[PDB]
Amino acid sequence: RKYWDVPPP
Amino acid sequence: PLATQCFQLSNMFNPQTEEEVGWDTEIKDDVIEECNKHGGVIHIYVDKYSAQGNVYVKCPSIAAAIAAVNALHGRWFAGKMITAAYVPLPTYHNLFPDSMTATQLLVPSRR
Structure with missing residues (x-):
């Protein structure tokens, strides 16, 4: 699970 | 704006596009885990109904917030x-009266 600091695709 | 123990996070999710069961518990754990790098959390509320994707947080101190x-x-x-x-602290306590006496640091639900 990775949501923090994930930029837009 | 004047710093207080309480804050609101926005744009954390869109409740209309959240289908997975217990998605709000996962958001809660994401916020607790991230705030442990700072001073921790004593109260958290994931708003499952506002389109803005709001998370309410209360820290153990103004410095932690x-x-x-x-x-x-x-x-x-x-x-x-x-x-x-x-x-503001009176605004937060009007929404969440049970947060007034909260003192214990919260632990995420997942491993």
Whole structure:
């Protein structure tokens, strides 16, 4: 699970 | 704006596009885990109904909330920019009266 600091695709 | 123990995170999710069961518990754990790098959390509420994707947080102290707001505001979360804003203490306690006596640091639900 990775949501923090994930930029837009 | 004047710093307080409480703050609100926005743009954390869109409740209409959240289908997975217990998604709000996972958001809660994401916020607890991230605020442990600062001073921890004593109260958290994931708003499952507002389209804005709001998370309410109460820290054990004003210093812990300043550390968390400065570190969380303007961050990417799931490809969207999040906003962190202070909530006046009487405004927060009117919404969440049970948070008035909260003292224990919260632990995430997942491993």
